[PDB]
């Protein structure tokens, strides 16, 4: 339904934020 | 419906976060 | 409605994230 | 209700993201 | 309720974004 | 329920934002 669709987009958002955390880690390392 | 509208805005949000991850990767590389 | 209000705030969130993406691109370029 | 409460927190989230955009602009300017 | 639970997580999300804003300010100030 | 699922993804989003704040703190320190 529409409520599962919202949960699925939030899962994609969490995945992109995890990627941003990883790159900010890489910036700090440099 | 409003429900679908919310899911579509979350899709747009995921896309912008994907772009931020890409630019942060480039910052880390430099 | 309250559901519309939520969608409108998510639109504002997408707008600010696009700006953050553009600035991170400028940081990467510099 | 909680539905207005949810919109109010999203408004706060938008405000913090606007602040992040502003600081990133300043980082870019010094870049 | 779960709608209250959703609002409570969004409050936590706002708090972390406030922290990110402060750290970005510190990066900018240096 | 999907409403619980939504709250659980928001918890994951908060966790990744906490990580971003921590890494930005490390960038700021340098």
JSON list of C-alpha atoms in Angstrom, two decimals:
[
{"chain": "A", "resi": 1, "resn": "UNK", "atom": "CA", "xyz": [0.00, 0.00, 0.00]},
{"chain": "A", "resi": 2, "resn": "UNK", "atom": "CA", "xyz": [0.92, 3.66, 0.41]},
{"chain": "A", "resi": 3, "resn": "UNK", "atom": "CA", "xyz": [2.22, 3.10, 3.94]},
{"chain": "A", "resi": 4, "resn": "UNK", "atom": "CA", "xyz": [4.66, 0.36, 2.82]},
{"chain": "A", "resi": 5, "resn": "UNK", "atom": "CA", "xyz": [5.77, 2.68, 0.01]},
{"chain": "A", "resi": 6, "resn": "UNK", "atom": "CA", "xyz": [6.63, 5.33, 2.60]},
{"chain": "A", "resi": 7, "resn": "UNK", "atom": "CA", "xyz": [8.58, 2.81, 4.68]},
{"chain": "A", "resi": 8, "resn": "UNK", "atom": "CA", "xyz": [10.51, 1.72, 1.57]},
{"chain": "A", "resi": 9, "resn": "UNK", "atom": "CA", "xyz": [11.52, 5.28, 0.74]},
{"chain": "A", "resi": 10, "resn": "UNK", "atom": "CA", "xyz": [12.66, 5.80, 4.32]},
{"chain": "A", "resi": 11, "resn": "UNK", "atom": "CA", "xyz": [14.82, 2.67, 3.98]},
{"chain": "A", "resi": 12, "resn": "UNK", "atom": "CA", "xyz": [16.42, 4.20, 0.85]},
{"chain": "A", "resi": 13, "resn": "UNK", "atom": "CA", "xyz": [16.99, 7.45, 2.77]},
{"chain": "A", "resi": 14, "resn": "UNK", "atom": "CA", "xyz": [18.72, 5.57, 5.60]},
{"chain": "A", "resi": 15, "resn": "UNK", "atom": "CA", "xyz": [20.98, 3.90, 3.01]},
{"chain": "A", "resi": 16, "resn": "UNK", "atom": "CA", "xyz": [22.02, 7.21, 1.48]},
{"chain": "A", "resi": 17, "resn": "UNK", "atom": "CA", "xyz": [22.70, 8.67, 4.93]},
{"chain": "A", "resi": 18, "resn": "UNK", "atom": "CA", "xyz": [24.92, 5.68, 5.72]},
{"chain": "A", "resi": 19, "resn": "UNK", "atom": "CA", "xyz": [26.84, 6.48, 2.53]},
{"chain": "A", "resi": 20, "resn": "UNK", "atom": "CA", "xyz": [27.18, 10.14, 3.54]},
{"chain": "A", "resi": 21, "resn": "UNK", "atom": "CA", "xyz": [28.50, 9.05, 6.97]},
{"chain": "A", "resi": 22, "resn": "UNK", "atom": "CA", "xyz": [31.07, 6.87, 5.25]},
{"chain": "A", "resi": 23, "resn": "UNK", "atom": "CA", "xyz": [32.31, 9.69, 3.01]},
{"chain": "A", "resi": 24, "resn": "UNK", "atom": "CA", "xyz": [32.45, 12.15, 5.90]},
{"chain": "A", "resi": 25, "resn": "UNK", "atom": "CA", "xyz": [34.59, 9.52, 7.64]},
{"chain": "A", "resi": 26, "resn": "UNK", "atom": "CA", "xyz": [36.86, 9.48, 4.61]},
{"chain": "A", "resi": 27, "resn": "UNK", "atom": "CA", "xyz": [37.13, 13.27, 4.63]},
{"chain": "A", "resi": 28, "resn": "UNK", "atom": "CA", "xyz": [38.09, 13.21, 8.32]},
{"chain": "A", "resi": 29, "resn": "UNK", "atom": "CA", "xyz": [40.71, 10.52, 7.65]},
{"chain": "A", "resi": 30, "resn": "UNK", "atom": "CA", "xyz": [42.26, 12.86, 5.11]},
{"chain": "B", "resi": 1, "resn": "UNK", "atom": "CA", "xyz": [-3.89, 11.15, -2.55]},
{"chain": "B", "resi": 2, "resn": "UNK", "atom": "CA", "xyz": [-1.81, 12.89, 0.10]},
{"chain": "B", "resi": 3, "resn": "UNK", "atom": "CA", "xyz": [-0.26, 9.56, 1.08]},
{"chain": "B", "resi": 4, "resn": "UNK", "atom": "CA", "xyz": [1.26, 9.10, -2.37]},
{"chain": "B", "resi": 5, "resn": "UNK", "atom": "CA", "xyz": [2.41, 12.72, -2.35]},
{"chain": "B", "resi": 6, "resn": "UNK", "atom": "CA", "xyz": [4.38, 12.03, 0.83]},
{"chain": "B", "resi": 7, "resn": "UNK", "atom": "CA", "xyz": [6.07, 9.00, -0.74]},
{"chain": "B", "resi": 8, "resn": "UNK", "atom": "CA", "xyz": [6.98, 11.05, -3.81]},
{"chain": "B", "resi": 9, "resn": "UNK", "atom": "CA", "xyz": [8.61, 13.77, -1.71]},
{"chain": "B", "resi": 10, "resn": "UNK", "atom": "CA", "xyz": [10.58, 11.10, 0.16]},
{"chain": "B", "resi": 11, "resn": "UNK", "atom": "CA", "xyz": [11.77, 9.79, -3.21]},
{"chain": "B", "resi": 12, "resn": "UNK", "atom": "CA", "xyz": [13.02, 13.29, -4.04]},
{"chain": "B", "resi": 13, "resn": "UNK", "atom": "CA", "xyz": [14.74, 13.47, -0.68]},
{"chain": "B", "resi": 14, "resn": "UNK", "atom": "CA", "xyz": [16.53, 10.16, -1.29]},
{"chain": "B", "resi": 15, "resn": "UNK", "atom": "CA", "xyz": [17.74, 11.51, -4.67]},
{"chain": "B", "resi": 16, "resn": "UNK", "atom": "CA", "xyz": [19.25, 14.65, -3.14]},
{"chain": "B", "resi": 17, "resn": "UNK", "atom": "CA", "xyz": [20.96, 12.59, -0.45]},
{"chain": "B", "resi": 18, "resn": "UNK", "atom": "CA", "xyz": [22.46, 10.37, -3.16]},
{"chain": "B", "resi": 19, "resn": "UNK", "atom": "CA", "xyz": [23.87, 13.52, -4.75]},
{"chain": "B", "resi": 20, "resn": "UNK", "atom": "CA", "xyz": [25.32, 14.70, -1.43]},
{"chain": "B", "resi": 21, "resn": "UNK", "atom": "CA", "xyz": [27.02, 11.31, -0.96]},
{"chain": "B", "resi": 22, "resn": "UNK", "atom": "CA", "xyz": [28.57, 11.62, -4.42]},
{"chain": "B", "resi": 23, "resn": "UNK", "atom": "CA", "xyz": [29.98, 15.09, -3.78]},
{"chain": "B", "resi": 24, "resn": "UNK", "atom": "CA", "xyz": [31.27, 14.11, -0.33]},
{"chain": "B", "resi": 25, "resn": "UNK", "atom": "CA", "xyz": [33.12, 11.20, -1.94]},
{"chain": "B", "resi": 26, "resn": "UNK", "atom": "CA", "xyz": [34.83, 13.72, -4.22]},
{"chain": "B", "resi": 27, "resn": "UNK", "atom": "CA", "xyz": [35.71, 15.96, -1.28]},
{"chain": "B", "resi": 28, "resn": "UNK", "atom": "CA", "xyz": [37.30, 12.93, 0.44]},
{"chain": "B", "resi": 29, "resn": "UNK", "atom": "CA", "xyz": [39.31, 12.11, -2.69]},
{"chain": "B", "resi": 30, "resn": "UNK", "atom": "CA", "xyz": [40.81, 15.60, -2.72]},
{"chain": "C", "resi": 1, "resn": "UNK", "atom": "CA", "xyz": [-5.33, 19.00, 5.92]},
{"chain": "C", "resi": 2, "resn": "UNK", "atom": "CA", "xyz": [-2.65, 17.60, 8.22]},
{"chain": "C", "resi": 3, "resn": "UNK", "atom": "CA", "xyz": [-1.46, 15.10, 5.61]},
{"chain": "C", "resi": 4, "resn": "UNK", "atom": "CA", "xyz": [-0.91, 17.90, 3.10]},
{"chain": "C", "resi": 5, "resn": "UNK", "atom": "CA", "xyz": [0.97, 19.92, 5.71]},
{"chain": "C", "resi": 6, "resn": "UNK", "atom": "CA", "xyz": [3.33, 16.98, 6.13]},
{"chain": "C", "resi": 7, "resn": "UNK", "atom": "CA", "xyz": [3.90, 16.74, 2.37]},
{"chain": "C", "resi": 8, "resn": "UNK", "atom": "CA", "xyz": [4.59, 20.47, 2.22]},
{"chain": "C", "resi": 9, "resn": "UNK", "atom": "CA", "xyz": [7.27, 20.25, 4.92]},
{"chain": "C", "resi": 10, "resn": "UNK", "atom": "CA", "xyz": [8.87, 17.34, 3.06]},
{"chain": "C", "resi": 11, "resn": "UNK", "atom": "CA", "xyz": [8.96, 19.57, -0.03]},
{"chain": "C", "resi": 12, "resn": "UNK", "atom": "CA", "xyz": [10.82, 22.17, 2.04]},
{"chain": "C", "resi": 13, "resn": "UNK", "atom": "CA", "xyz": [13.23, 19.48, 3.23]},
{"chain": "C", "resi": 14, "resn": "UNK", "atom": "CA", "xyz": [13.93, 18.39, -0.37]},
{"chain": "C", "resi": 15, "resn": "UNK", "atom": "CA", "xyz": [14.57, 22.05, -1.26]},
{"chain": "C", "resi": 16, "resn": "UNK", "atom": "CA", "xyz": [17.20, 22.49, 1.45]},
{"chain": "C", "resi": 17, "resn": "UNK", "atom": "CA", "xyz": [18.88, 19.18, 0.58]},
{"chain": "C", "resi": 18, "resn": "UNK", "atom": "CA", "xyz": [19.20, 20.30, -3.06]},
{"chain": "C", "resi": 19, "resn": "UNK", "atom": "CA", "xyz": [20.97, 23.41, -1.78]},
{"chain": "C", "resi": 20, "resn": "UNK", "atom": "CA", "xyz": [23.29, 21.32, 0.40]},
{"chain": "C", "resi": 21, "resn": "UNK", "atom": "CA", "xyz": [24.06, 19.13, -2.62]},
{"chain": "C", "resi": 22, "resn": "UNK", "atom": "CA", "xyz": [24.97, 22.20, -4.71]},
{"chain": "C", "resi": 23, "resn": "UNK", "atom": "CA", "xyz": [27.26, 23.56, -1.99]},
{"chain": "C", "resi": 24, "resn": "UNK", "atom": "CA", "xyz": [28.99, 20.20, -1.50]},
{"chain": "C", "resi": 25, "resn": "UNK", "atom": "CA", "xyz": [29.65, 20.19, -5.26]},
{"chain": "C", "resi": 26, "resn": "UNK", "atom": "CA", "xyz": [31.25, 23.63, -4.88]},
{"chain": "C", "resi": 27, "resn": "UNK", "atom": "CA", "xyz": [33.39, 22.37, -1.99]},
{"chain": "C", "resi": 28, "resn": "UNK", "atom": "CA", "xyz": [34.50, 19.36, -4.06]},
{"chain": "C", "resi": 29, "resn": "UNK", "atom": "CA", "xyz": [35.34, 21.58, -6.98]},
{"chain": "C", "resi": 30, "resn": "UNK", "atom": "CA", "xyz": [37.42, 23.84, -4.74]},
{"chain": "D", "resi": 1, "resn": "UNK", "atom": "CA", "xyz": [-2.85, 15.79, 17.49]},
{"chain": "D", "resi": 2, "resn": "UNK", "atom": "CA", "xyz": [0.24, 13.74, 16.68]},
{"chain": "D", "resi": 3, "resn": "UNK", "atom": "CA", "xyz": [-0.24, 14.44, 12.98]},
{"chain": "D", "resi": 4, "resn": "UNK", "atom": "CA", "xyz": [0.29, 18.18, 13.61]},
{"chain": "D", "resi": 5, "resn": "UNK", "atom": "CA", "xyz": [3.13, 17.18, 15.94]},
{"chain": "D", "resi": 6, "resn": "UNK", "atom": "CA", "xyz": [4.73, 15.31, 13.04]},
{"chain": "D", "resi": 7, "resn": "UNK", "atom": "CA", "xyz": [4.43, 18.34, 10.75]},
{"chain": "D", "resi": 8, "resn": "UNK", "atom": "CA", "xyz": [5.96, 20.53, 13.46]},
{"chain": "D", "resi": 9, "resn": "UNK", "atom": "CA", "xyz": [9.00, 18.28, 13.79]},
{"chain": "D", "resi": 10, "resn": "UNK", "atom": "CA", "xyz": [9.40, 18.26, 10.00]},
{"chain": "D", "resi": 11, "resn": "UNK", "atom": "CA", "xyz": [9.37, 22.06, 10.09]},
{"chain": "D", "resi": 12, "resn": "UNK", "atom": "CA", "xyz": [12.18, 21.92, 12.66]},
{"chain": "D", "resi": 13, "resn": "UNK", "atom": "CA", "xyz": [14.09, 19.49, 10.46]},
{"chain": "D", "resi": 14, "resn": "UNK", "atom": "CA", "xyz": [13.75, 21.82, 7.46]},
{"chain": "D", "resi": 15, "resn": "UNK", "atom": "CA", "xyz": [15.10, 24.70, 9.59]},
{"chain": "D", "resi": 16, "resn": "UNK", "atom": "CA", "xyz": [18.17, 22.72, 10.64]},
{"chain": "D", "resi": 17, "resn": "UNK", "atom": "CA", "xyz": [18.84, 21.72, 7.02]},
{"chain": "D", "resi": 18, "resn": "UNK", "atom": "CA", "xyz": [18.65, 25.39, 6.01]},
{"chain": "D", "resi": 19, "resn": "UNK", "atom": "CA", "xyz": [21.31, 26.08, 8.64]},
{"chain": "D", "resi": 20, "resn": "UNK", "atom": "CA", "xyz": [23.48, 23.27, 7.25]},
{"chain": "D", "resi": 21, "resn": "UNK", "atom": "CA", "xyz": [23.10, 24.71, 3.73]},
{"chain": "D", "resi": 22, "resn": "UNK", "atom": "CA", "xyz": [24.28, 28.08, 5.03]},
{"chain": "D", "resi": 23, "resn": "UNK", "atom": "CA", "xyz": [27.36, 26.67, 6.72]},
{"chain": "D", "resi": 24, "resn": "UNK", "atom": "CA", "xyz": [28.22, 24.59, 3.64]},
{"chain": "D", "resi": 25, "resn": "UNK", "atom": "CA", "xyz": [28.03, 27.77, 1.57]},
{"chain": "D", "resi": 26, "resn": "UNK", "atom": "CA", "xyz": [30.61, 29.31, 3.88]},
{"chain": "D", "resi": 27, "resn": "UNK", "atom": "CA", "xyz": [32.86, 26.25, 3.61]},
{"chain": "D", "resi": 28, "resn": "UNK", "atom": "CA", "xyz": [32.57, 26.45, -0.18]},
{"chain": "D", "resi": 29, "resn": "UNK", "atom": "CA", "xyz": [33.44, 30.15, -0.10]},
{"chain": "D", "resi": 30, "resn": "UNK", "atom": "CA", "xyz": [36.70, 29.42, 1.70]},
{"chain": "D", "resi": 31, "resn": "UNK", "atom": "CA", "xyz": [37.43, 26.57, -0.70]},
{"chain": "E", "resi": 1, "resn": "UNK", "atom": "CA", "xyz": [0.83, 5.04, 20.05]},
{"chain": "E", "resi": 2, "resn": "UNK", "atom": "CA", "xyz": [2.94, 4.62, 16.93]},
{"chain": "E", "resi": 3, "resn": "UNK", "atom": "CA", "xyz": [2.11, 8.11, 15.64]},
{"chain": "E", "resi": 4, "resn": "UNK", "atom": "CA", "xyz": [3.65, 9.49, 18.82]},
{"chain": "E", "resi": 5, "resn": "UNK", "atom": "CA", "xyz": [6.57, 7.12, 18.28]},
{"chain": "E", "resi": 6, "resn": "UNK", "atom": "CA", "xyz": [7.06, 8.58, 14.80]},
{"chain": "E", "resi": 7, "resn": "UNK", "atom": "CA", "xyz": [7.00, 12.13, 16.17]},
{"chain": "E", "resi": 8, "resn": "UNK", "atom": "CA", "xyz": [9.55, 11.16, 18.82]},
{"chain": "E", "resi": 9, "resn": "UNK", "atom": "CA", "xyz": [11.99, 9.81, 16.22]},
{"chain": "E", "resi": 10, "resn": "UNK", "atom": "CA", "xyz": [11.57, 12.96, 14.15]},
{"chain": "E", "resi": 11, "resn": "UNK", "atom": "CA", "xyz": [12.50, 14.94, 17.27]},
{"chain": "E", "resi": 12, "resn": "UNK", "atom": "CA", "xyz": [15.68, 12.85, 17.55]},
{"chain": "E", "resi": 13, "resn": "UNK", "atom": "CA", "xyz": [16.38, 13.46, 13.87]},
{"chain": "E", "resi": 14, "resn": "UNK", "atom": "CA", "xyz": [16.01, 17.23, 14.38]},
{"chain": "E", "resi": 15, "resn": "UNK", "atom": "CA", "xyz": [18.48, 17.02, 17.31]},
{"chain": "E", "resi": 16, "resn": "UNK", "atom": "CA", "xyz": [21.11, 15.24, 15.20]},
{"chain": "E", "resi": 17, "resn": "UNK", "atom": "CA", "xyz": [20.70, 17.73, 12.36]},
{"chain": "E", "resi": 18, "resn": "UNK", "atom": "CA", "xyz": [21.24, 20.56, 14.86]},
{"chain": "E", "resi": 19, "resn": "UNK", "atom": "CA", "xyz": [24.51, 18.86, 15.80]},
{"chain": "E", "resi": 20, "resn": "UNK", "atom": "CA", "xyz": [25.55, 18.51, 12.15]},
{"chain": "E", "resi": 21, "resn": "UNK", "atom": "CA", "xyz": [24.79, 22.21, 11.62]},
{"chain": "E", "resi": 22, "resn": "UNK", "atom": "CA", "xyz": [27.02, 23.14, 14.54]},
{"chain": "E", "resi": 23, "resn": "UNK", "atom": "CA", "xyz": [29.90, 20.98, 13.30]},
{"chain": "E", "resi": 24, "resn": "UNK", "atom": "CA", "xyz": [29.60, 22.44, 9.81]},
{"chain": "E", "resi": 25, "resn": "UNK", "atom": "CA", "xyz": [29.71, 25.90, 11.40]},
{"chain": "E", "resi": 26, "resn": "UNK", "atom": "CA", "xyz": [32.90, 24.88, 13.18]},
{"chain": "E", "resi": 27, "resn": "UNK", "atom": "CA", "xyz": [34.40, 23.66, 9.90]},
{"chain": "E", "resi": 28, "resn": "UNK", "atom": "CA", "xyz": [33.42, 26.98, 8.30]},
{"chain": "E", "resi": 29, "resn": "UNK", "atom": "CA", "xyz": [34.80, 29.11, 11.15]},
{"chain": "E", "resi": 30, "resn": "UNK", "atom": "CA", "xyz": [38.19, 27.43, 10.82]},
{"chain": "F", "resi": 1, "resn": "UNK", "atom": "CA", "xyz": [2.23, -2.87, 11.22]},
{"chain": "F", "resi": 2, "resn": "UNK", "atom": "CA", "xyz": [3.70, -0.51, 8.63]},
{"chain": "F", "resi": 3, "resn": "UNK", "atom": "CA", "xyz": [3.43, 2.38, 11.09]},
{"chain": "F", "resi": 4, "resn": "UNK", "atom": "CA", "xyz": [5.87, 0.55, 13.33]},
{"chain": "F", "resi": 5, "resn": "UNK", "atom": "CA", "xyz": [7.98, -0.11, 10.24]},
{"chain": "F", "resi": 6, "resn": "UNK", "atom": "CA", "xyz": [8.04, 3.62, 9.54]},
{"chain": "F", "resi": 7, "resn": "UNK", "atom": "CA", "xyz": [9.14, 4.37, 13.11]},
{"chain": "F", "resi": 8, "resn": "UNK", "atom": "CA", "xyz": [11.88, 1.75, 12.83]},
{"chain": "F", "resi": 9, "resn": "UNK", "atom": "CA", "xyz": [13.26, 3.31, 9.65]},
{"chain": "F", "resi": 10, "resn": "UNK", "atom": "CA", "xyz": [13.19, 6.72, 11.31]},
{"chain": "F", "resi": 11, "resn": "UNK", "atom": "CA", "xyz": [15.25, 5.23, 14.16]},
{"chain": "F", "resi": 12, "resn": "UNK", "atom": "CA", "xyz": [17.77, 4.02, 11.57]},
{"chain": "F", "resi": 13, "resn": "UNK", "atom": "CA", "xyz": [17.83, 7.48, 9.99]},
{"chain": "F", "resi": 14, "resn": "UNK", "atom": "CA", "xyz": [18.56, 9.07, 13.38]},
{"chain": "F", "resi": 15, "resn": "UNK", "atom": "CA", "xyz": [21.41, 6.60, 13.93]},
{"chain": "F", "resi": 16, "resn": "UNK", "atom": "CA", "xyz": [23.04, 7.47, 10.61]},
{"chain": "F", "resi": 17, "resn": "UNK", "atom": "CA", "xyz": [22.67, 11.20, 11.28]},
{"chain": "F", "resi": 18, "resn": "UNK", "atom": "CA", "xyz": [24.41, 10.67, 14.64]},
{"chain": "F", "resi": 19, "resn": "UNK", "atom": "CA", "xyz": [27.28, 9.08, 12.71]},
{"chain": "F", "resi": 20, "resn": "UNK", "atom": "CA", "xyz": [27.43, 12.01, 10.27]},
{"chain": "F", "resi": 21, "resn": "UNK", "atom": "CA", "xyz": [27.59, 14.43, 13.21]},
{"chain": "F", "resi": 22, "resn": "UNK", "atom": "CA", "xyz": [30.46, 12.48, 14.74]},
{"chain": "F", "resi": 23, "resn": "UNK", "atom": "CA", "xyz": [32.46, 12.43, 11.50]},
{"chain": "F", "resi": 24, "resn": "UNK", "atom": "CA", "xyz": [31.81, 16.13, 10.87]},
{"chain": "F", "resi": 25, "resn": "UNK", "atom": "CA", "xyz": [33.10, 16.70, 14.42]},
{"chain": "F", "resi": 26, "resn": "UNK", "atom": "CA", "xyz": [36.30, 14.92, 13.41]},
{"chain": "F", "resi": 27, "resn": "UNK", "atom": "CA", "xyz": [36.62, 17.07, 10.27]},
{"chain": "F", "resi": 28, "resn": "UNK", "atom": "CA", "xyz": [36.07, 20.20, 12.37]},
{"chain": "F", "resi": 29, "resn": "UNK", "atom": "CA", "xyz": [38.78, 19.14, 14.83]},
{"chain": "F", "resi": 30, "resn": "UNK", "atom": "CA", "xyz": [41.21, 19.06, 11.92]}
]
